[PDB]
Amino acid sequence: VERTFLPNGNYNIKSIFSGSLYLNPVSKSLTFSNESSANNQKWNVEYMAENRCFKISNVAEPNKYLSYDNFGFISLDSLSNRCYWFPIKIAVNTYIMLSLNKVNELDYAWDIYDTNENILSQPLLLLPNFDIYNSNQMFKLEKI
Amino acid sequence: NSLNDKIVTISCKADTNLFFYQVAGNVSLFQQTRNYLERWRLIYDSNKAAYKIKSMDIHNTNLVLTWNAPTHNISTQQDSNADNQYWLLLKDIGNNSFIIASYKNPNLVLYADTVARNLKLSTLNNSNYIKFIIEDYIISDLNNFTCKISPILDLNKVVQQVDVTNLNVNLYTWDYGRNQKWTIRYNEEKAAYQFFNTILSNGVLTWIFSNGNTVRVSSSNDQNNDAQYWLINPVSDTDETYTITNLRDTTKALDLYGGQTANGTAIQVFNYHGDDNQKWNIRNPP
Amino acid sequence: SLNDKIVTISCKADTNLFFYQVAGNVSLFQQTRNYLERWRLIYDSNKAAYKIKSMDIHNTNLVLTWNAPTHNISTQQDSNADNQYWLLLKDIGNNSFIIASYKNPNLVLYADTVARNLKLSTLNNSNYIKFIIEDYIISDLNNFTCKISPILDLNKVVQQVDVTNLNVNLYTWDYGRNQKWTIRYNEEKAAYQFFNTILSNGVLTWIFSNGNTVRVSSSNDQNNDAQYWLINPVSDTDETYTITNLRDTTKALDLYGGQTANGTAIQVFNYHGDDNQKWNIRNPP
């Protein structure tokens, strides 16, 4: 039963820079790659009532969640308070994804670097967030 | 520590005509003013290995560049030695520019909004908007400055080239002629300046050392003559007064002959003693 | 200024660890004083960034590469790719460098000193992202305790005579401390001193007073630019150098007349590139 603006379930995750690139793990990093139709591009979003956040696990590795490391990268790890995400919906299914925890006493958010809107081979990082207008912090969650 | 206590201007690699400018706690980007509103003292803390950037404002004397966390805004606030008032000066070698990162959070660096004309914090990228030129304020003020040069013994007279063909240099009453104006240019390699007379294209103030103490204008396509280059050192307590010493032999200072103030008086070099006839006001032509 | 310079790169978090390359693999390793730890900095002026190229004599086209999107750094064939360019940011006052990826300048090299390899990190204040980039000659010679031989007799050696006789002569190698020199680079004067290991502060000093001669004397004489020397690698060697004096750079260190014989005087003479002015600086075996 629905508690929030983002229903529980399986999603693809995309950067607004590209409608043809999909979030998946590559080694220990997260990156956006060509469509594979595989489970590793599928993400299970689950609302957590107690803290009003979302945990997001990889369907191919369902005991691993999107988290972040001590080096500024998003990671795929076992459950911890680093796995709680606080989304800000800014358009149809466009979101900014804040870490639940303040980091370095700021909001920090998923951030993908672009070179003239090209994100190929970039790792997804966790970087400061100041507002809702940073294109590198905008992500599409597409139910599928 | 090679930068500790240095007074600098900071301008934008993205728009080299824009300088960090301070008034009443507001930092903005503004055209060159050649005055304290665009001057900043770099203050080094060796433990943090980071710098405070202190405004040389004459009225509020303890303002330092401050990141207004958690926003991305920048201002000048009273110096409390806080981490959000410290900055890493990271010199991008080969590009002659600096990335200026927050010591409190080095994920974030200064970014020049050249259309709002102010500064904010930003994550890094490869644009010139995060790159700055930090320069000794004297070099900054004088480099490419077209000036007139007067002895402090009489500010109504100027050092001039006689005319376009007569390359001699003497003292004359200011009459607004181009032979009475000089464009200063800093030579990065030599760490020295030339004074180009504006009546010519390639003529520079030169010590004619093969003729004792004479100074004349000659061509700057004579290339390795240190006698064409000068050190320009401010005199304490003054805004416009300088001693001017020759690069070939720094003991040789630009010198008003005798301290005589009459029209036609020789400009020469002489051994430096710092008397009033070896002090010069470098000024805007009105 | 750094373009085309061959350097070593070591860790501020551990100055005994250097960037080391073998067969496409980059690690952090103790000092080798050879090409495995040498890199040519190759500047691209339009990118304002550098390729960092291994001086490996077998595979000559390997450059420091970020294997984006992973955390791994290796050496790959130079394809002039964005993941092979680096911003060299000198942290002023700290005399260390941050090395940021051109492909993603939010990420910089991070020295994993426990794993002895390279990783990436966003910018922070730790020493693990700061590096010491040094001209390879300075890197090899600074704090190197060596023996110095003329190339006209490798089994002979520049020595001080004894702890009290501060004169300097040629003599056959016998492993004596009077026959070894600890080189120290003075960053300020951009020159070196040779500390004889039989004295605490005895340094090799050109005594210009008696003209052309060389003794050692106390290094607590502070502003003498004949207590200082320039060391220049003889081209296409491994261990061979010319040694020129700071006060007069035309005045190289000279083996009197070319005489490979015991007690032959050590002096300066006017440069000539001639064999009694070439020297082998080596680790004492």
- Residue C109: list chain B partners with CB under 8 A: none
* Residue A136, Ramachandran bin (φ over 0: left; ψ between -120 and 50: alpha; else beta): alpha
Burial class (CB in 10 A: 0-12, 13-18, 19+), C168: buried
DSSP 8-state symbol, C263: T
CA distances from A66 to A47, A85, B278, C80 (A): 14, 9, 71, 33
Question: How close B89 comes to chain C (CA, Å)?
Answer: 6
Alpha helices for chain C (secondary structure H) = 136-141
Domain count, chain B: 2
Euclidean distance between CA atoms C157 and B182, whole angstroms: 60
- Pair (C212, C184) in one structural domain: yes
Q: Torsion angle, CA of A70/A75/A80/A84, rounded to 10 degrees?
A: 110
- Residue A25 Ramachandran class (φ > 0 left, ψ -120 to 50 alpha, else beta): beta
Burial B92-122 (b: 16+ CB within 10 A, else e): bbbbebbbbbbbbbbbbbbbbeeeeebbbbb
User: Does C160 count as an annotated binding residue?
Assistant: no
Rounded to an integer, what distance in angstroms lies between the CA atom of residue C267 and that of residue C215? 8
Token code pair at residue B200: 């010519």
Count Cβ atoms within 10 A of the Cβ of residue B70 and give its class: 0-12 exposed, 13-18 middle, 19 or more buried: middle
| The pair of three-digit structure tokens given for residue A82, joined into one six-digit string | 């680093």
Chains that touch B (3 or more CB pairs under 8 A): A, C
Q: What is the DSSP letter of A118?
A: B
Q: How far apart are CA C100 and CA C118, in angstroms?
A: 13
Q: Distance between CA C237 and CA C134 in Å, rounded?
A: 20
CA distances from C22 to C60, C101, C146 (A): 11, 22, 27
d(Cα B172, Cα C254) in Å, to the nearest integer? Answer: 59
Co-location of C239 and C285 in the same domain = yes
Neighbours of B191 (CB within 10 A): 11
Contact C219, C231 (CB under 8 A): no
CA distance linking residue B153 with residue B141, whole number of Å: 24
Number of CB atoms found within 10 A of residue C226's CB: 19
B265 vs B169: CA distance, rounded Å: 9
Check whether residue C131 and residue C150 sit in a common domain: no
Residue A133 structural domain? 1-144
Is the CB of residue B72 less than 8 Å away from at least one CB of chain A?
A: yes
Query: Pick from C70, C83, C110: which is nearest to A27 by CB?
Result: C70
C80 contact partners, CB below 8 Å, separation of at least 6:
C51
Instruction: Report cis status (omega within 30 of 0) of the bond before C69.
Output: yes
- Give the H/E segment covering residue A67: strand A61-68
Chain C residues contacting B via beta carbons under 8 Å: 1-3, 43, 45, 47-48, 50, 87-94, 98, 100, 102, 105-106, 122-125
Q: Which of B91, B123, B144 is the last residue of a domain?
A: B144
Token pair 């820079």 in the structure block, residue? A17
How far is B110 from B10, CA to CA, in rounded Å? 12
Q: Do C89 and B90 touch (CB under 8 A)?
A: yes
Structure tokens at C271: 């440069």
DSSP string for chain B: --STT-EEEEEESS-TT-EEEEETTEEEEE----SGGG-EEEEEETTTTEEEEEE--SSSTTEEEEE-TTSSBEEEEE----GGG-EEEEEETTTTEEEEEESS-TT-EEEEETTTTEEEEE---SSGGG-EEEEEHHHHHHTT-EEEEEETT-TTEEEEE--SS--BEEEEE----GGG-EEEEEETTTTEEEEEETTSSSEEEEE-GGGTTBEEEEETTS-S-GGG-EEEEEPTT-SSEEEEEESS-TTEEEEEGGG--STT-BEEEEE----GGG-EEEE---
Phi–psi pair at B208, nearest 5 degrees = -80, 75
CATH number where B174 lies: 2.80.10.50
Asked if residue B196 and residue B151 are part of one domain, the reply reads: yes
Same domain, C138 and C208: no
- For B217, B264, C118, C263, the CA distances from B170, given in Å and listed in that order, are 11, 5, 65, 65
Q: What span, in angstroms and rounded, lies between the C-alpha atoms of C283 and C285?
A: 6
Q: What subunits make at least 3 CB pairs under 8 angstroms with C?
A: A, B
Beta carbons of A44 and A10 less than 8 angstroms apart: yes
Q: What is the resolution of this structure in A?
A: 2.1
Say how far apart CA B165 and CA C216 lie, in whole Å: 60
Instruction: Count up the domains in chain A and report the number.
Output: 1
DSSP letter (8 states) at residue C77: E
Contact status, residue B256 vs residue B276, Cβ threshold 8 Å: no
Residue C45 φ then ψ, to 5°:
-70, -25
Q: For the residues of C106-150, what is the DSSP string, one character each?
A: TEEEEEETTTTEEEEEE--S-GGG-EEEEEHHHHHHTT-EEEEEE
Decide if C253 contacts C214 (C-beta within 8 A). Answer: yes
β-pairing, A29-34 with B109-113? unpaired
What CATH number should be reported for the domain holding residue A95? Answer: 2.80.10.50
Phi-psi label, residue B83: left if phi above 0, alpha if psi -120 to 50, beta otherwise? alpha
What one-letter code names the amino acid at A114?
D
For B209-235, letters b (16+ CB in 10 Å) and e give beeeebbbbbebeeeebebbbbebebb
Question: Could you tell me which residues come within 8 angstroms of residue A47 by beta carbon, excluding any fewer than 6 positions away?
Answer: A3, A4, A6, A8, A53, A54
> Which residues lie below 8 Å from residue B3, measured CB to CB, with a gap of 6+?
B42, B44, B51, B89, B134, C92, C93
CA distances from A139 to A39, A93, A142 (A): 19, 8, 10
B94 and B130 together in one domain: yes
B92 is written with which tokens?
């991008």
The bridge status of strand C213-218 relative to strand C202-207 is antiparallel
Is C115 found in the same domain as C8? Answer: yes
* Three-state DSSP state, C178: helix
Q: Mapped to the 3 state alphabet, what secondary structure does B73-114 carry?
A: EEEEEECCCCHHHCEEEEEECCCCEEEEEECCCCCCEEEEEC
For residue B179, give the amino acid letter. Answer: N
Measured between beta carbons, the chain A residues lying within 8 angstroms of C122 are 71-72, 125, 127
Question: For the CA atoms of A40, C104, A106, B83, what is the dihedral angle to 10 degrees?
Answer: 150
A128 touches chain B (CB under 8 A): yes
Q: Are residues C228 and C164 in the same domain?
A: yes
CA–CA separation, B188 vs B199, rounded Å? 24
Containing domain of residue C34, as a range? 1-143
In this structure, are residues B77 and B124 in contact, taking their beta carbons and an 8 Å threshold? no
Q: What is the dihedral of CA C184, C188, C189, C192, to 10 degrees?
A: 10
C28 contacts C8 by C-beta, under 8 angstroms? no
B126 and B8 co-located in one domain: yes
Closest partner residue to B103 (CB to CB) among C50, C89, C125 is: C125
Of the residues B115, B144, B173, the one at which a domain ends: B144
Same domain, C172 and C53: no
Polymer length of chain C: 285
Yes or no: say if A90 and A96 are a contact pair by the CB < 8 Å rule: yes
Task: Give the number of A-B residue pairs with CB atoms closer than 8 Å.
Answer: 25
Closest Cβ opposite residue B70 in set A106, A115, A136: A106
Residue C68 and residue A28: Cβ atoms within 8 Å?
Answer: no
Angle among Cα C271, C272, C274 to the nearest 5 degrees reads: 120
Burial environment of residue A93 by CB neighbours within 10 A (0 to 12, 13 to 18, 19 or more): middle
Q: Are C69 and A29 an interchain contact pair (Cβ–Cβ within 8 Å)?
A: yes
State the amino acid at position A22 in one-letter form. Answer: Y
Contact status of A118 with chain B (Cβ, < 8 Å): no
CB contact under 8 A, A105 and B69: yes
The Cα B126–Cα C48 span in angstroms is 9
Residues C17 and C132 in one domain: yes
DSSP string, C196-210: ETTSSSEEEEEEGGG
| Closest partner CB to B90 (pick from C43, C98, C124) | C98
Asked how this structure was determined, the answer is X-ray
| Mutation target among A71, A111, A130, A135 for the B interface, most CBs of B within 10 A | A130
Q: Exposed, middle or buried, B186 (CB in 10 Å: 0-12/13-18/19+)?
A: buried
What whole-number distance in Å separates Cα of residue B221 and Cα of residue B212? 22
Boundary of a domain, candidates C84, C115, C143: C143
Q: What angle do CA A127, A87, A64 make, to 5 degrees?
A: 75
Q: Residue A124 carries which DSSP code?
A: P
Six-digit token string for B101: 């990162």
Q: Which residues of B touch C98 (CB under 8 A)?
A: 90
CB of A105 less than 8 A from some CB of B: yes
Q: Could you tell me if C95 and C118 lie in one domain?
A: yes
Which one, of A54, A128, A43, lies nearest residue A86 by Cα? A54
DSSP C182: E
Amino acid B204 reads: V
Cβ A123–C104 below 8 Å, yes or no? yes
DSSP labels, A3-62: -SSS-SEEEEEEETT-SSEEEEEETTEEEEEE---SGGG-EEEEEETTTTEEEEEETTEE
Nearest to A122 among C69, C110, C121 (CB): C69
Q: Of C84, A36, A72, give the one whose Cα is nearest residue B105.
A: A72
- Residue A73 forms contact with C (CB below 8 Å): yes
Q: Are C75 and C66 in contact (CB under 8 A)?
A: no
Other CB atoms within 10 A of residue C222 CB:
7
Rg of the Cα trace of chain A?
14
